[PDB]
Design a binder for this molecule. Structure first.
Ligand SMILES: CNC(=O)CNc1cc(=O)[nH]c2ccc(Nc3ccnc(Cl)c3C#N)cc12
Ligand SMILES: CNC(=O)CNc1cc(=O)[nH]c2ccc(Nc3ccnc(Cl)c3C#N)cc12
Ligand SMILES: [Cl-]
Ligand SMILES: [Cl-]
Lengths: 5, 123, 123, 5
């Protein structure tokens, strides 16, 4: 996996 | 404020391809001369300008069989259909012209671009 | 010997979401208490273990309406449905418990994992 | 974009 898009 | 799962899109495509292999919820047969290809209308539309126009037409949207132009090569279509469901294009010297002509007909600009570049480099 | 177009999967998902917004070729309504959500069966199956089991069942595969358990929160479902079509999860303090309970019911392990981590960190 | 996968 999870990221800040 | 959203968070994003990087592999989600590729995982979805992976599962849509597994559905295609098992023939699950396939709703159209694409006829390319003597050959038949089972697919999902939504995946075809999401990948091709031609299928987007066909399946948004009020009459054609209801067809279970779509016959392509007899000039379309079934191997070229097969390679593009695998590309649609996998992001991988099996481009070779023996198939590049048929792949390119098929991508132009199906309206798949990215495939047309890569085909043009591999042709120019050889050449 | 294949070549790969990196953005293909995300582009496909982008187009499937545009089809959903315009209500094109949506073939199922998911009823979550008072709320209705139109979706594509293949996208639901490709994202959820519960929908994969429902739409591969020889009887349920033919249903145009699927009613979820009354314990399921419609906002939680809505957020997960947007996640399915976009890879982005709108996870907030006010919705995390409903999102997590809904992901467990829908069988979406990756969402359950991220929800557990955001809960443990707070605590 | 195109890459060798
Ligand atoms: C011109 O422009 C004709 N169109 C295309 C040209 C091209 O080279 N590739 C496409 C790939 C997918 C699609 N499909 C869509 C485009 C926009 N909105 C939606 Cl909802 C879809 C779908 N499904 C179209 C083209
Ligand atoms: C257990 O395992 C139950 N399954 C899931 C658990 C989970 O956490 N996430 C899923 C996401 C998608 C899907 N969907 C598929 C899995 C395998 N083959 C296919 Cl073809 C599909 C589709 N469509 C299932 C699960
Ligand atoms: Cl393309
Ligand atoms: Cl998930």
């Amino acid at each position: 996996a999870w990221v800040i898009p | 404020s959203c968070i994003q799962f990087t592999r989600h899109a590729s995982d979805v495509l992976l599962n849509l391809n597994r559905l295609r292999s098992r023939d699950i919820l396939t709703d159209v047969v694409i006829v390319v001369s003597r050959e038949q290809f089972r697919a999902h209308k939504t995946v075809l539309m999401a990948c091709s300008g031609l299928f987007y126009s066909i399946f948004t037409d009020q009459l054609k949207c209801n067809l279970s069989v779509i016959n392509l132009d007899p000039e379309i090569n079934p191997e070229g279509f097969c390679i593009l259909l695998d590309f649609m469901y996998t992001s991988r294009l099996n481009l070779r010297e023996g198939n590049i012209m048929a792949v390119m002509a098929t991508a132009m007909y199906l309206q798949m600009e990215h495939v047309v671009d890569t085909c043009r570049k591999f042709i120019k480099a050889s050449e």
